[PDB]
Amino acid sequence: VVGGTEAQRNSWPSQISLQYRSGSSWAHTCGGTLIRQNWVMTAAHCVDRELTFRVVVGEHNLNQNDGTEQYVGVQKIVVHPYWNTDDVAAGYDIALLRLAQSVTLNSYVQLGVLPRAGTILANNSPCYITGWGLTRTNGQLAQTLQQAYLPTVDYAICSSSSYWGSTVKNSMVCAGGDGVRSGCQGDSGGPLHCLVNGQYAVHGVTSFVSRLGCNVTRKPTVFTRVSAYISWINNVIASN
Secondary structure, three states: OEOOEEOOOOOOOOEEEEEEEOOOOEEEEEEEEEEEOOEEEEOHHHHOOOOOEEEEEOOOEOOOOOOOOEEEEEEEEEEOOOOOOOOHHHOOOOEEEEEOOOOOOEOOEOOOOOOOOOOOOOOOOOEEEEEOOEOOOOOOEOOEOEEEEOOEEOHHHHOOOOOOHHHOOOOEEEEOOOOOOEOOOOOOOOEEEEEEOOEEEEEEEEEEOOOOOOOOOOOOEEEEEHHHOHHHHHHHHHHO
16 A cells, blocks of 8 residues: 555454465465455455465554464455456456354454445545555555555546546446555455445455556556445355
C-alpha cells in the first residue's frame, strides 16, 4: 500500500497474509480475507505458482512476534474455472483456499463480511485497502499492516479512456487513483473494505495496478468485485 497509514492491530481482523515457503523460512506474497474459519478468499493470480502456501491470521507485523498469530497450511486451492493468468483483464481473479484446520476467532481473527450479491457501490464510496504490499512503486513490503483511504471510481468513469478503458470490466471495482495512495505488489488478494449502512464489508479482492506504477493518477487500483461471485463462493464452500 502506497500512501497508507499503519492500521490499528484490531481494525481489520479478516485480513490474512498468504505466504509461500522460501527455503528455511516463509515470504509474504499476497493478502487474503478470512471468510470461514477454514476458508480464505484471495486472488487467483496469487496462487498461479506451484508453491507451498500457508496463511497467517492475527498477523500485524511480518517481522515481529505480535503474540496473536495463528499459522495454518493451505489444504486445497480452488481457482475460478474461468481464470486465465495471461489475461487478468478478463477478470475472474479470485480463488478460495481451504485451510488445513479451522482457526480460532478473537478480536484479531474474524470472518470478513461479504456484500449482498449484485451490490454496486455509487461512485466515490468510502473504502480502505489494507495490506503489506510495497509502500512505493518498485519499493519494499511494509512490515506493519497498512491501510489507505481509496474511494471507489464507478464503472462508467473507470472504463473511460483516460482511466482503464476496456481493461476494466463490470465484474471489477476500481478505487483510488489520486496519484498518491494505492495498492501495490504484495497487496493482491487482499480486501477492499467499504463502509455501507454503518458496516464495513469486503467488496473487493485486490487484482492489479498499472504496469507504469502503483500510485498512478487515473489508474485506480482494480479489484475483483466480490458481489459478483457470491454464488460461486457459496457453491465452492458447499462442495469441498
